[PDB]
Amino acid sequence: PQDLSEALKEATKEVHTQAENAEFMRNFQKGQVTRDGFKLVMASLYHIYVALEEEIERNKESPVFAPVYFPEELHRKAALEQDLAFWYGPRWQEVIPYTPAMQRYVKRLHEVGRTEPELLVAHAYTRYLADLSGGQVLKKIAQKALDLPSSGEGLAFFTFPNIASATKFKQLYESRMNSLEMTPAVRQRVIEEAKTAFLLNIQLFEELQELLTH
Numbered sequence: 284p285q286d287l288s289e290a291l292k293e294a295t296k297e298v299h300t301q302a303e304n305a306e307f308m309r310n311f312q313k314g315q316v317t318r319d320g321f322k323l324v325m326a327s328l329y330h331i332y333v334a335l336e337e338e339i340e341r342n343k344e345s346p347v348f349a350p351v352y353f354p355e356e357l358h359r360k361a362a363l364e365q366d367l368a369f370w371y372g373p374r375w376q377e378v379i380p381y382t383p384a385m386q387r388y389v390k391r392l393h394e395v396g397r398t399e400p401e402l403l404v405a406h407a408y409t410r411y412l413a414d415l416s417g418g419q420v421l422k423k424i425a426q427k428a429l430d431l432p433s434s435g436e437g438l439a440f441f442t443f444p445n446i447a448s449a450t451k452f453k454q455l456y457e458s459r460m461n462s463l464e465m466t467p468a469v470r471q472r473v474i475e476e477a478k479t480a481f482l483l484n485i486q487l488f489e490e491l492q493e494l495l496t497h
């Protein structure tokens with residue numbers, strides 16, 4: 284539709300299905316997930332969020348992003364640090380992996396926040412609404428499949444403490460996105476960058492699948 288939030292959903296319908304068919308993702312979707320597979324996903328999320336959040340901070344005051352700037356409600360770096368310390372130990376920062384697919388995703392994030400900030404919204408939208416929408420089912424799948432100790436840590440990433448209602452926050456977020464002022468050219472590029480975002484994820488899964496089954 285005419286609303287960007289609406290245009291984005293319809294346009295990425297295909298890549299979303301593709302992301303779904305991602306072996307690593309479909310397996311996870313079916314419960315087929317191992318500690319090592321999970322650990323790789325968390326390290327992956329950590330590098331992605333460090334880059335994303337780093338770029339969001341860089342453009343927080345820009346009209347092309349300010350409306351969707353939700354630091355308290357959305358930041359994930361801290362939660363992931365808390366999770367990685369659990370999954371990788373006190374020296375997690377020295378052992379977590381940083382694979383080519385992770386780097387490639389990080390690279391496009393920085394390229395966007397630095398040279399194409401008007402498109403950062405596409406990446407924030409893809410990531411945040413992805414993690415906010417399916418986060419619970421995946422977390423749920425995780426604790427049941429991972430059978431982790433009652434340590435009380437490792438899954439903080441999946442809980443957005445500063446968000447009482449995901450559905451309501453989503454409405455607010457979509458409204459903020461639609462409040463953004465952009466020309467048809469930029470809107471087309473943002474739509475296209477959303478797809479690029481899914482593709483980067485899809486290639487990430489593919490890689491983590493090649494790594495896990497080796």
Ligand code: HEM
Nearest residue numbers: 288291292302303308309312408409412413416417481484
């Ligand atoms: C097998 C895996 C997946 C399943 C079954 C799944 C399922 C869904 C479902 C049913 C929705 C709710 C639709 C809505 O109310 O808007 C949703 C929304 C969404 N998903 Fe996924 N998803 C999966 C993987 C992913 C991945 C890998 C990403 C991207 C990294 C992603 C990004 C999104 C986004 C951005 C939305 C927001 C849609 C909107 O604009 O309203 N999903 N997903």
